[PDB]
Design a protein around this nucleic acid. Sequence first.
RNA 1: UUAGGGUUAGGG
RNA 2: UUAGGGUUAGGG
Lengths: 181, 181
Amino acid sequence: SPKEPEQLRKLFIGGLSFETTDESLRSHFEQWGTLTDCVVMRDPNTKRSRGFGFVTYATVEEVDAAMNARPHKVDGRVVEPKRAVSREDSQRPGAHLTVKKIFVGGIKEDTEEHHLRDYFEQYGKIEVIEIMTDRGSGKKRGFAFVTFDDHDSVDKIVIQKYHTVNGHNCEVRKALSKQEM
Amino acid sequence: SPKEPEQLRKLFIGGLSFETTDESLRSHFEQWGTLTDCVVMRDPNTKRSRGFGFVTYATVEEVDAAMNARPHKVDGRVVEPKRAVSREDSQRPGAHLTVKKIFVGGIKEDTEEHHLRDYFEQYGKIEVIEIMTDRGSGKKRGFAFVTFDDHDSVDKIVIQKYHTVNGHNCEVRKALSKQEM
RNA sequence: UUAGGGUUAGGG
RNA sequence: UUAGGGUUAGGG
């Protein structure tokens, strides 16, 4: 009886201690809901832990409640849980990078800070809003950077590439530095 | 009449818009106290802005109140203020890197999380505390990583290299990744 | 079309 | 002496 989809309910649990089994991974994350699925990824030959796994709750509400419980110490080790990234986007560069900033392209020269603030507040607490303009000329360049205080907010946004802000169909990507491009 | 030293009262203001003068830099940061010193660094020949400057309050209280006002938009641009780093440490690698994690070496096999928590809480809100141990052997390795929610907390700590925690003289350095060493 | 200015570490 | 395990992205 699961209404919400699987990917929205799934969490990638990276950095798992090599002592973590399916059972010890389940016995930890079950404190924040019921687990539809809980697996520790292993090598097909050695069956040794590959250092990451997946958990899937019945509700996305439980997924958010799980993320509200960071940090997570499973089997005596701090793990890094991340919202599940599609097998599509996982091939794209920087999809797995933990960032607190996003790229917003297509705002089209009439979008100000309050437009971004009023829209993106619904995903998390906003730190900075930078409307990119051409220096000296003052012309707006049609894209902006929004920085949140929590990386999980960014991860919830970029799974939906397209957003309609201020009457524009915009693209939202994870903010990559110049040295990662 | 300045009791506290100069370096503790000085802030490095990086990323300054090239339109920022001493006066516009002062007219912004004077909202959080009195400015002992306020300079925009320029090239000796062109006198064009080098993109950074310094401000110095009369109290470190005003310096903390200034940092509580992040982000700072000076002359229509978000600037990155940092606690002043000695001309010594500025030669050391990674001193200017904005990090939220610290290295703590010398805790010596009898220091647990609560020892680090009770000591380092006095500098800011703590996110994670990782006591580094040898896998499989369980032996403690004598160093730890402490992650704060604010980079400014880390910057206030690492200006004092040596700290006495749990009866040990420990070294505190900025957490550098493996790829920056 | 929609990728940032890391000259963003010292003048006195 | 006091530098981290980025095999931390898919099994079904």
